Amino acid sequence: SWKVCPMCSEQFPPDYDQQVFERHVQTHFDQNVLN
Amino acid sequence: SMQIFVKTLTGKTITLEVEPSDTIENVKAKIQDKEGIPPDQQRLIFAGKQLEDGRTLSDYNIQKESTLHLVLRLR
Ligand SMILES: [Zn+2]
Incomplete structure (x- = not known):
């Protein structure tokens, strides 16, 4: 269940919460660089 | 004339089955056809x-068997 952010290419392990991951991805459309 | 993945x-x-001349909006419509997601909610x-909706796959030099990513957006 690894997840990849399509905007910054960070990878998120299987146990990383899906909804928090999705929120991360969406935040790039507010601010491209999040670190 | 080529396969891509989303x-x-x-x-x-x-x-998906696409042509290089397909616009991004065309690709979104193919996604709606297959999966049900409205185009205006797709990135x-x-x-x-x-x-960008009005550009084509060829305008981005996206070649066969490439993987695109779909992210939903709120309207
Ligand atoms: Zn990211």
């Missing part, structure tokens, strides 16, 4: 770049 944030892979991303 990966969702839940990990599902959608396969399509390739190699970190949001693809």
Whole structure:
């Protein structure tokens, strides 16, 4: 269940919460660089 | 004339049949046909770049068997 952010290419392990991951991805459309 | 893949944030892979001359909006309509998602709620991303509706796959030099990413947007 690894997840990849399509905007910054960070990878998120299987146990990383899906909804928090999705929120991360969406935040790039507010601010491209999040670190 | 070529196959591309569209990966969702839940990990599902959608396969599509496209032509290089297809616009990004055309690709979104193919996604709606196959998966049901309204085009205006789709962002399509390739190699970190949001693809613009009025441009074509060829305008981004997206070649066969490439993987796009689909991210939903609120309207
Ligand atoms: Zn990211």
